[PDB]
Design an enzyme around this catalytic site. Structure first.
Site, PDB file in Angstrom:
ATOM      1  N   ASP A  35       0.835  -1.200   0.000  1.00 18.40           N
ATOM      2  CA  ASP A  35       0.000   0.000   0.000  1.00 18.40           C
ATOM      3  C   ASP A  35       0.872   1.253   0.000  1.00 18.40           C
ATOM      4  OD1 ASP A  35      -1.891   1.941   0.277  1.00 18.40           O
ATOM      5  OD2 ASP A  35      -2.495   1.371   2.306  1.00 18.40           O
ATOM      6  N   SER A 199      -0.393  15.626 -12.199  1.00 17.36           N
ATOM      7  CA  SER A 199      -0.624  15.230 -13.581  1.00 17.36           C
ATOM      8  C   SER A 199      -0.877  16.465 -14.443  1.00 17.36           C
ATOM      9  CB  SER A 199      -1.806  14.264 -13.668  1.00 17.36           C
ATOM     10  OG  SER A 199      -2.132  13.989 -15.018  1.00 17.36           O
TER      11      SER A 199
END
Ligand SMILES: NCc1ccc(C(F)(F)F)cc1
Ligand SMILES: NCc1ccc(C(F)(F)F)cc1
EC number: 3.4.23.22
Length: 330
Positions: A35, A199
């Site tokens: 994770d 992004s």
């Protein structure tokens, strides 16, 4: 040194991925959920409330000659989905695919939430975010990656998740045969403890690429892709009959529809998520309404590049002194 381990989807939808991990002496092998959105290594154990264990493999410190109780230490964690667990802390030897760390904090669950009990395939979590998020009190503990860093050939690990298929977590080296083209690296902010990056935009299907900054985290421990409401609405508007359902808790779509791809930007490069990756199947057995793999982050507070996005790429987690994230097509 280096390590390499195969990671396998737990079900037919890729809801999560498990990776075998050896704990203790002699080895006790548990299948953990790696994770990058959390920083605790915790396991089902012989100390976990009996009624809260349903098929999981448990860690038994009393059978490990290298286990040491970390006196007075406790841990308690709550995940963004409402899951939670808590207990006490051992140190032990932990090995991943040939890579060994001595004196790793192994957090023994005394209590787990219902979502963990019902997931018989996941024996615990292995956190790979930054150690500032570790919940051990009163003495914070380091992640498996932070403890291994010095011994690694290169302070990196890479995630190569499969679509309905096994994949690979590598520690300490970059497999240049596992991707096509070049790796594009982008800056990471550690200020919230996550692998947080920006992004550069997106496109829906064959549409025009929209240049716009989307800040979010790279999280192997989250199944879906959570993006701002504006982006998510633009995607689902291209799917006939798709709508947001309050009763279901997200966008659903007719199971007979074909889904467009989704492109996201990394610097000047583009990662394309095939439309089939966005199909998470009927909302209930026999239903003709299917659940979408791109959902709004509005209720969450942060954008999450989960498995839906990451499994479309070869992903480098560069834990150098200035950390970066690398993305490549594969
Ligand atoms: N996979 C761990 C995780 C889960 C939830 C969140 C949230 F919701 F806080 F963004 C971050 C990290
Ligand atoms: N993001 C951490 C995480 C991972 C898995 C689960 C599940 F699947 F067990 F509920 C909850 C939270």
């Amino acid at each position: 040194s280096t390590g390499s381990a195969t990671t396998t989807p737990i079900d037919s939808l890729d809801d999560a991925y498990i990776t075998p991990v050896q704990i203790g002496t002699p080895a006790q092998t548990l299948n953990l959920d790696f994770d990058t959105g959390s920083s605790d290594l915790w396991v089902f154990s012989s100390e976990t409330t009996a009624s809260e264990v349903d098929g999981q493999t448990i860690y038994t410190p009393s059978k490990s000659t290298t286990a040491k109780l970390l006196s007075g230490a406790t841990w308690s964690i709550s995940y963004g989905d409402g899951s939670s667990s808590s207990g006490d802390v051992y140190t032990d030897t932990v090995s991943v695919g040939g890579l060994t760390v001595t004196g790793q904090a192994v957090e023994s669950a005394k209590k787990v939430s219902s979502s963990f009990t019902e997931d018989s395939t996941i024996d615990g979590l292995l956190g790979l975010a930054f150690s500032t998020l570790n919940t051990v009190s009163p003495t914070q503990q380091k992640t498996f990656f932070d403890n291994a860093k010095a011994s690694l050939d290169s302070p990196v690990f890479t995630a190569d998740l499969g679509y309905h298929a096994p994949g690979t977590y590598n520690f300490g080296f970059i497999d240049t045969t596992a991707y096509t083209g070049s790796i594009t690296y982008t800056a990471v902010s550690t200020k919230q403890g996550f692998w947080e990056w920006t992004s550069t935009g997106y496109a829906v299907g064959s549409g025009t690429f929209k240049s716009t900054s989307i800040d979010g985290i790279a999280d192997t421990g989250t199944t879906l892709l959570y993006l701002p409401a504006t982006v998510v609405s633009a995607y689902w508007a291209q799917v006939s009959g798709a709508k947001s359902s309050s009763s279901v808790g997200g966008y659903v779509f007719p199971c007979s529809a074909t889904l467009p791809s989704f492109t996201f930007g990394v610097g000047s490069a583009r990662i394309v998520i095939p439309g089939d990756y966005i199909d998470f199947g009927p909302i209930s057995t026999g239903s003709s309404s299917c659940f979408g793999g791109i959902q709004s982050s509005a209720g969450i507070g942060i954008n999450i590049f989960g498995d839906v996005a990451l499994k479309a790429a070869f992903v480098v987690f560069n834990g150098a002194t200035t950390p970066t994230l690398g993305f490549a097509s594969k």
